[PDB]
Amino acid sequence: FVDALKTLCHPVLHEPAPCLQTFTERGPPSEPAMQRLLECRFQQEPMGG
Amino acid sequence: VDRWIRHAAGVERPQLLDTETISMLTFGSMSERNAAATVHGQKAACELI
Numbered sequence: 001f002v003d004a005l006k007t008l009c010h011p012v013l014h015e016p017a018p019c020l021q022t023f024t025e026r027g028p029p030s031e032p033a034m035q036r037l038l039e040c041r042f043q044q045e046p047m048g049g
Numbered sequence: 050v051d052r053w054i055r056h057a058a059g060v061e062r063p064q065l066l067d068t069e070t071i072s073m074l075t076f077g078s079m080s081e082r083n084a085a086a087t088v089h090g091q092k093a094a095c096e097l098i
Contacts, residue, residue: 033056 001008029035055062066074074080 033059 029038052062070078
């Protein structure tokens with residue numbers, strides 16, 4: 001890996017923006033048996049009480 | 050439990066074959082389609098307890 005550190009430290013492995021873009025191009029799941037995993041909700045709410 | 054089994058095994062439902070299609074299938078039918086690509090050959094195995 002000491003040879004491989006000329007490759008691993010490049011930011012092209014640390015830029016998932018085309019990867020996220022392709023995942024958005026695939027969009028939501030289509031098969032019904034994988035309609036059971038979209039129940040992850042990242043929303044906003046107060047933290048007071 | 051049948052929906053859970055069909056999800057766990059990956060195989061889909063029958064999705065309501067008509068009774069004339071049932072008499073067709075007990076007369077004979079080619080239900081399973083071909084795969085995407087085969088490089089080795091046509092598949093063959095069975096199972097016995």
